[PDB]
């Protein structure tokens, strides 16, 4: 809720887009297709903000 600091947080994913919605649409479709044997979940971070 601080407009001054928001761009710095959005870049580092402390508060902003969720991992499923800032990756390229190709990557997120790729990741869920192969999650059975090769997981790309713990790498990209998803923010949570109170």
């Amino acid at each position: 809720a601080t407009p001054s600091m928001m761009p710095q947080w959005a870049y580092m994913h402390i508060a902003g887009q969720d991992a499923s919605e800032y990756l390229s649409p190709g990557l997120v479709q790729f990741a869920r297709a192969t999650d059975t044997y090769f997981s790309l979940g713990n790498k990209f971070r998803n923010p949570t903000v109170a």
Binding site: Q29, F30, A33, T34, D35, T36, G41
Partner: peptide
């Protein structure tokens, strides 16, 4: 396009479940 890499639980691939969930901290 990328669904050809997914196991087929029948005729529909097991792709889905959007839980690219990556967040944990002491919190």
């Amino acid at each position: 396009n990328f669904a050809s890499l997914a196991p087929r639980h029948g005729t529909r691939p097991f792709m889905g479940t959007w839980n690219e969930i990556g967040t944990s901290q002491l919190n």
